[PDB]
Design a protein around this ligand. Structure first.
Ligand SMILES: Nc1ncnc2c1ncn2[C@@H]1O[C@H](COP(=O)(O)O)[C@@H](O)[C@H]1O
Ligand SMILES: Nc1ncnc2c1ncn2[C@@H]1O[C@H](COP(=O)(O)O)[C@@H](O)[C@H]1O
Ligand SMILES: [Fe+3]
Ligand SMILES: [Fe+3]
Ligand SMILES: [Fe+3]
Ligand SMILES: [Fe+3]
Lengths: 194, 194
C-alpha cells in the first residue's frame, strides 16, 4: 500500500492533493498514476513505486516562487536554481516539500519525481516510466500524443528520446531558456530515435 | 590588406581555396566575406578583420575525420571533441589548419572562425558578425532567411538569438546531437528575442 512509503492513505493523499491543486492538475496526476502503472508492468518496474511517483509527480506544481527559493536555501541546493522557474523547480525542488508533507524517504521515487521534467543523462527505468507516463497519460491530447503512445508501447528508451526531442524543439520554437540538464537527457537518448 | 594577417594575397588565397573546396562552398565563403563586411560597417567592427574571417570561416570544411583527429591530439584539445564530427570540428579544430597553412595568428579572427558554428555564451562583436554573416549571406535561400536578414539589419544580438534558436529547433526536429556549447549560446542570447 501507499502507507508503505508515505504517512497517509491513498484516499487521504487524494483529499490533501485536491486542496493543493486545481481539478485539471489533479486529474492529470491520476492520469499519470494509471499510465505509470501500465508502463511499469510492460517494462519490469515495481508497479506500486511507479503509481505513487506518478500521482505525486506534480504535487508541488503550485508552490510559490517564494517557497521554492526558501527551499533552495534550507536544503542548500545548487545556487544556479535561483536563475530558473517553476518548470525546473516543481520536480527538482518540489521533492523537498513532498518529503516534508508526506514523510517520503524512498530514494527511487524521490529521484523519479526529481527529474520528471528535465530527465538526466542516466535514468533508472522507474525514472523513465514517470518521465514518459507524464507525457502520454490519457487526458493529454497535444498533436503527436498518438505517436508518443505507439513508441511507449514498444520502447521506453525511444519514448524518452522522442519526448525529449519534442520538448527541446518546442522550447527553441517558443524562444524559452532550456535547462542544461535537459540537453544532457537529449544527447544521451537521441541515438534511440534511429 | 590580407597580407597584414596571412602569408599570401587575397588572390593567392582564393586560388588556394578553390583547390580545397567545391564551387558551392567557395561561393558561400565569398558570400560571407561580403556579408561580414556590411555587418562590420553597421555594428562598428573592423571591416577587414570581418571580411577575412568571413572568407576563411569554412576553409577547413573538407578536412577528413582523420586529419581532425590528428589535430585534436597534436594541439591537445578537449578529448570530448573525438565524440563529435565535422559540424563541430571545421571551426573548433579547423582553426589549427588555417594557422598552419596561412600563418594566421590574430586571436580575434581565430576566435571568430573557432566558434562560427556553435557560438559561445560570451561573443565579441566580431564573433557575432561572422556567426550571423554565415547565416544571411546572399547565396542562402532557406525559408526564413528574409526574417534573419531584417533582424540583422537592426540588431546583431537579436540576429544571434534568432539564428541559434532556429538551429537548436532544427537539430531537435532532425534528431541530431546538439553540441553543449550551442546551448550555452542559446541561453545567453535567447532573452534578445523579446
Ligand atoms: N529544460 C527545460 N527548461 C525549461 N522548461 C522545460 C524544460 N524541459 C521541460 N520544460 C517545460 O516545463 C513544463 C512542465 O513540464 P512537465 O513537468 O513535463 O509537465 C513544460 O511546459 C515543459 O515544456
Ligand atoms: N551544436 C551543434 N551540434 C551539431 N551540429 C550543429 C550545432 N550547431 C550547428 N550545427 C550544424 O552544423 C552545420 C554547419 O553549420 P555552419 O558552420 O553554421 O554552416 C549545420 O548543418 C548546423 O545545423
Ligand atoms: Fe511536472
Ligand atoms: Fe505532469
Ligand atoms: Fe561552417
Ligand atoms: Fe559557412
Amino acid at each position: 500500500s501507499y502507507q508503505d512509503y508515505i504517512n497517509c492513505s491513498r484516499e487521504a493523499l487524494l483529499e490533501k492533493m485536491a486542496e493543493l491543486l486545481p481539478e485539471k492538475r489533479l486529474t492529470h496526476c491520476l492520469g499519470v498514476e494509471r499510465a505509470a502503472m501500465e508502463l511499469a508492468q510492460r517494462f519490469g518496474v515495481d508497479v506500486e513505486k511507479a503509481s505513487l511517483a506518478g500521482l505525486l509527480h506534480d504535487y508541488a506544481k503550485k508552490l510559490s516562487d517564494q517557497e521554492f527559493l526558501v527551499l533552495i536555501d534550507r536544503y542548500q541546493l545548487d545556487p544556479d536554481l535561483k536563475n530558473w522557474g517553476n518548470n525546473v523547480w516543481h520536480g527538482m525542488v518540489g521533492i523537498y516539500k513532498i518529503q516534508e508533507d508526506l514523510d517520503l524517504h524512498d530514494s527511487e521515487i524521490l529521484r523519479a519525481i526529481e527529474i520528471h521534467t528535465v530527465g538526466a543523462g542516466q535514468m533508472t527505468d522507474l525514472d523513465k516510466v514517470i518521465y514518459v507516463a507524464d507525457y502520454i497519460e490519457h487526458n493529454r491530447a497535444f498533436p503527436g500524443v498518438d505517436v508518443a503512445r505507439e513508441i511507449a508501447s514498444l520502447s521506453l528508451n525511444k519514448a524518452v528520446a522522442y519526448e525529449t526531442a519534442r520538448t527541446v524543439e518546442y522550447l527553441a520554437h517558443q524562444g524559452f531558456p532550456i535547462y542544461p540538464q535537459t540537453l544532457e537527457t537529449y544527447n544521451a537518448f537521441v541515438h534511440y530515435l534511429k
